[PDB]
């Protein structure tokens, strides 16, 4: 069967948008990701979600933001969506200054660690590299 | 006597297969996020989520091919990766 989605609110949508990075990185600023975030915000307002764009966060600010949101009261929300736009590699999302384990971010919403979201779907949309292999295609 | 696992009910919609680059276009946005938004706009009133993401797979897989003056990055493709520990079907309506 199917999840229960007529709680009063659909839930939170947390959009972290990292376009500009620190010196110690030397990573290109990710042009066009603002088009992405603006696109995400309206899509999810149409799905009746509470969006929150946060832009240009250090890897410390990210873990804090997620710890905070994971301690909120989600009891009247059906679900929780989280969108990370940034550089990355396998298992890793980049704050403006260095990398974060994705399991550090996601562990704040483990059912034992976030009771108001247990039994409810938690969605992580991740736009980031996962390595440096290229897909060349066929046919 | 009833528990669920602590990693259940997570969905991971990665933009690209494990190990690979993800492609972003300078003016239109990353390939994955454009398709995800187009597909939800079309079908989130019609289709379970996993089937919306399967359509995002097909869109990214068939309607994008990297273009670059740099030969190493030219004519490259990408396939996104649905990682689903969900236990039920998800409808946005």
């Amino acid at each position: 069967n199917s999840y229960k989605m007529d709680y009063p609110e659909m839930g939170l949508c947390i959009i972290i948008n990292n376009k500009n990075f620190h010196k110690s990185t030397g990573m290109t600023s990710r042009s066009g990701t603002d088009v992405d975030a603006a696109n995400l915000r309206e899509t999810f307002r149409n799905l009746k979600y509470e969006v929150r764009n946060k832009n240009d966060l250090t890897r410390e600010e990210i873990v804090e933001l997620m710890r905070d949101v994971s301690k909120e009261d989600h009891s009247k929300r059906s679900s929780f969506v989280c969108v990370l736009l940034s550089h990355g590699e396998e298992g890793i999302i980049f704050g403006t200054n260095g990398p974060v384990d994705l399991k550090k971010i996601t562990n704040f919403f483990r059912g034992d660690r976030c009771r108001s979201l247990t039994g409810k779907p938690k969605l992580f949309i991740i736009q980031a590299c996962r390595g440096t292999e290229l897909d060349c295609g066929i046919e | 006597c009833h528990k669920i696992p602590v990693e259940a009910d997570f969905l991971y919609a990665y933009s690209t297969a494990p190990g690979y680059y993800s492609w972003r276009n300078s003016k239109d946005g990353s390939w994955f996020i454009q398709s995800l938004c187009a597909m939800l706009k079309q079908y989130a009133d019609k289709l379970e989520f996993m089937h919306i993401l399967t359509r995002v797979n097909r869109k990214v897989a068939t309607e994008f091919e990297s273009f670059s003056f740099d030969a190493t990055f030219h004519a490259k493709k990408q396939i996104p990766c649905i990682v689903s520990m969900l236990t039920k079907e998800l409808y946005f309506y």
Partner: peptide, 4 residues
């Protein structure tokens, strides 16, 4: 088109 730019790698992320």
């Amino acid at each position: 088109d730019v790698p992320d």
